[PDB]
């Protein structure tokens with residue numbers, strides 16, 4: 024399913040620090056340059072180990088086998104009502 | 107932005123995209139809405155079946171020829187017959203086999219073809235022209251971009267003739283609708299979803315977003331309004347007000363929604 | 364009279380079995396997987412599958428402070 | 440995309456006509 | 471379907487595809503012009519490959 028709410032992480036700095044505005048501008052720059060994206064793909068997806076089919080199914084024919092056996096059952100029924 | 111810098115307005119509330127260049131001159135509140143540059147095209151027509159699609163795999167010539175062949179076999183039998191029935195059997199065998207196969211190829215061709223997935227595919231093909239607004243955050247994004255795909259796309263867009271750029275959103279969308287799917291419009295995800303939820307509903311968004319950014323409320327640098335507005339945006343975000351508002355304007359009253 | 368009936372019917376069933384045969388190959392296998400829970404709304408409505416969050420943090424506080432129906436129920 | 444080829448099948452049509460020709464031949468030598 | 475599997479083409483049709491998949495490992499010589507080409511290269515695909 025989807026996400027319950029939409030929010031985000033962030034770099035935290037003490038109120039009134041000289042580092043705050045530089046840090047923010049840095050994050051913006053990294054965001055627009057795609058640094059954050061490439062980093063995410065690096066750690067999450069790129070090395071991701073989890074990652075059409077020509078193969079046989081016994082299951083698809085099973086239903087028709089059921090209608091076959093049912094048909095033969097009806098056949099036995101008719102054979103009985105006749106005799 | 108100009109009104110904010112030169113003090114003609116105390117605050118700016120609008121789908122204003124947060125960019126570094128704008129963050130240098132003004133102050134942005136925490137984003138109240140999330141978006142991204144996305145691709146809008148014309149959705150393909152579902153079906154136009156006719157009865158002609160059944161006569162498609164086998165040629166009209168083959169139908170006429172098999173009819174005359176049929177009547178020829180009948181008039182031959184009218185005048186030994188074992189090789190006739192045999193040859194006819196082989197004939198209709200080859201034909202029904204051929205029909206079955208060609209029809210199979212039709213059915214492959216139908217579902218197999220994928221028109222567009224991601225922006226990279228747009229960059230790799232010249233068949234479908236594509237463009238953005240005459241101005242705004244998206245165009246500037248493509249322009250300043252050093253990223254391979256976006257660089258290529260920008261080069262094409264600027265160099266392409268006639269101009270692929272449009273003045274307004276409605277113009278771009280109208281261009282998407284009129285072009286029979288030969289034109290793609292690059293616009294922020296929000297607007298795309300909104301237009302996608304509005305009649306005639308002939309347009310759709312394909313693939314993910316090219317980038318991830320957000321809108322925000324802007325206030326003059328050193329304004330007293332900045333921190334209260336920000337804490338307010340946070341309050342609304344946590345309270346779910348923003349979510350309910352988007353559902354209100356975008357989805358809930360959606361005609362095709 | 365019945366000969367052309369047999370003929371037309373044979374042609375009909377011929378075209379149909381041919382079409383079915385052709386489409387089945389293309390259809391192949393969907394390999395689709397069933398999902399017990401489609402969305403968060405469904406989760407609130409069933410007691411069969413228990414669910415939880417961390418002992419503390421933003422998620423727990425979200426559920427605690429939530430005035431939204433579904434999330435409220437889930438929290439309770 | 441449909442070749443719907445009349446040419447490939449044309450040959451089988453030819454062997455059909457040939458078979459019916461031989462058939463007419465046999466029908467003639469019979470009577 | 472099986473005979474279309476035989477008819478299936480392009481396991482790897484380009485250098486880019488190697489960059490796009492982690493299943494098949496790939497490499498160059500311990501030294502020489504190729505490795506240095508990949509090291510010094512600033513163009514996207516080959517860069518990724520070098521990384």
Ligand SMILES: C=C(C)[C@H]1CN[C@H](C(=O)O)[C@H]1CC(=O)O
Pocket residue numbers: 121122123124239241242243244245275293294
């Ligand atoms: C709709 C317009 C013209 C605005 C809205 N956001 C972008 C902005 O903040 O400039 C512009 C669109 C864009 O560039 O994708």
Ligand SMILES: C=C(C)[C@H]1CN[C@H](C(=O)O)[C@H]1CC(=O)O
Pocket residue numbers: 416417419420421422423
């Ligand atoms: C992993 C932990 C304990 C942290 C990380 N982010 C959330 C936070 O910032 O509160 C917490 C998880 C959570 O609340 O479910």
Ligand SMILES: C=C(C)[C@H]1CN[C@H](C(=O)O)[C@H]1CC(=O)O
Pocket residue numbers: 499501502503504505
């Ligand atoms: C065969 C070797 C080691 C030499 C030949 N040319 C390259 C060179 O001129 O260094 C080297 C191969 C390579 O770098 O792939």
